[PDB]
Amino acid sequence: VNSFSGYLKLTDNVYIKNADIVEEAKKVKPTVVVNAANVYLKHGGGVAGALNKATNNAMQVESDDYIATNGPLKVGGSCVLSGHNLAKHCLHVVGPNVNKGEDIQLLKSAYENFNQHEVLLAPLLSAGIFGADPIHSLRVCVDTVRTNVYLAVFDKNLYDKLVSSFL
Numbered sequence: 001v002n003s004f005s006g007y008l009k010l011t012d013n014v015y016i017k018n019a020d021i022v023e024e025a026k027k028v029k030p031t032v033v034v035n036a037a038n039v040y041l042k043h044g045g046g047v048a049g050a051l052n053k054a055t056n057n058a059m060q061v062e063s064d065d066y067i068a069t070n071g072p073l074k075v076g077g078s079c080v081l082s083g084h085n086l087a088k089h090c091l092h093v094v095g096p097n098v099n100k101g102e103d104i105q106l107l108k109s110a111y112e113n114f115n116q117h118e119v120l121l122a123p124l125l126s127a128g129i130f131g132a133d134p135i136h137s138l139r140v141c142v143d144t145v146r147t148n149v150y151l152a153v154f155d156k157n158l159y160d161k162l163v164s165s166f167l
């Protein structure tokens, strides 16, 4: 038993809700929140900008020290950093950004990072301003992640479409 409430059950291990990831993390305080990061951990918009803003820029400060020491992530890769006031940990995961010309086949690789964590609160990777098809991202998530993932979709209209089209 965990603290997640109000989710539609999609499969044995995947759940979904129409929620802003920031409000959802502040309420649950999960062990792991996933950030939809870029390789530079530059948290400008989408999920990253919203999460970072909620940490009063502490996420960005921590991230800049990480990059200065380790260099950029790979597309498809991840790193674990602090969750600040939102979670114990933040798993920064880089899905392919379609609007950047990155290979969408790396979306499966990106979701594989979730399997290193028993339970996660996460957004749909590569959706929204990353330019991939959200229906596709949800399908790759369900077909790749084996651990317990609580998916949050902020756009109501998108949420309704994802549910009604899910096989």
Ligand SMILES: Nc1nc(N)c2ncn(Cc3csc(Cl)n3)c2n1
Pocket: 019, 020, 021, 022, 036, 046, 047, 050, 122, 123, 124, 125, 126, 127, 128, 129, 130, 152, 153, 154, 155
């Ligand atoms: N659950 C949630 N909460 C937000 N505050 C939010 N903002 C943009 N998206 C969609 C998204 C997924 S991956 C990238 Cl990039 N954007 C969000 N999803």
